[PDB]
Amino acid sequence: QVQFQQSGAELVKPGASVKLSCKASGYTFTSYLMHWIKQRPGRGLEWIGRIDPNNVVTKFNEKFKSKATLTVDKPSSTAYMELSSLTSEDSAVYYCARYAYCRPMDYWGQGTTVTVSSAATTPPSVYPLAPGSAAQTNSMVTLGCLVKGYFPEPVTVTWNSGALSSGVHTFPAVLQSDLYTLSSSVTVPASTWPSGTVTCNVAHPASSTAVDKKIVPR
């Protein structure tokens, strides 16, 4: 009905500027102010700037004057943001939001996440983590496979080759130095590990890898 199509994901690298767009949809574009708001990966929002589709004029943040050019396309009711040659320090999720008098909004788009990585598609070095930590050996033991150092984001990790659902928790991934890092966990009880053996699968589609790494005590 009244929608707001922003694109979906973008990969910029350090020193490459980006032009992102907000396609506005089903309302009278020019007679509604537009905002752009960054959400840095997971802690707090920052308003960036402000376009008026009727006259084009912008207020910026104190913070984004050396970075964005907010610019509009009236016939296609699109409202593009341009970010001049950027640091590793602004890989985020960006949102255009429209608003009438004084709001961040009444509508925001999906939020085009432009992840700023100069390094390309690469295979994850998965490590066996052993439960040898602070706690006496009792009933259920928690094991973990850490699939470190991969590019791009897509890893699809099955634990004991496929059959064991009952205790697995893969984590949401993080990104240390332009590539990603993730672990996947499991907690089967004593009368399984080490005897009924544990080894994990590492599937990472783009850079061909289907890795079977084994868990032990060290």
Binding site: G44, W47, K59, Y101, Y107, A173
Partner: protein, 211 residues
Amino acid sequence: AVVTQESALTTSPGETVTLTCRSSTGAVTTSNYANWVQEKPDRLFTGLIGGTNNRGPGVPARFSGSLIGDKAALTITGAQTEDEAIYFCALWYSNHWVFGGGTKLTVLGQPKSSPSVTLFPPSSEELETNKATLVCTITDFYPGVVTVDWKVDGTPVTEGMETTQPSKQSNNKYMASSYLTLSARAWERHASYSCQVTHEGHTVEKSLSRA
């Protein structure tokens, strides 16, 4: 400007709740034009109360526009399970907006049980690249607001802690992970590396060692 909200809270589905939004520079006069915008299930943000009191087109009439005294205040009357979300307050510093950190809300489904924490070792393998990596497996927690504190031998780690935000698992209770990343000498002359987790102001502790 610090536009300072609350950090996190709970109310049980049915009961009323009042969210506040105070600011660094004195007191939220109407001039601010106060805003409330919420996020929910997978990154969609819906806007809520504009200009201290005006409801967004379809924001249900429970949500109340209320500048309480000094501070701006949202209230969610008759709080419901369809209101468990992160709410952002926004205050207009004359010729530019500034966002609070939000609050996450919990509309008290399944009871408040704690985290099954398990810290991990740096494995024999990354020790060849001279990296040594730490995972703290923090899991099963409700509500979604736990913290991470790390200490390398008494010493609270200021050095490079990377973490996750509360991923909702399968029965709708949360999990998290914390990556402490270091190089071998930075591991070695150090014995107890200590994983600290808090729920509602109540901690847990795990460690490793070397001798």
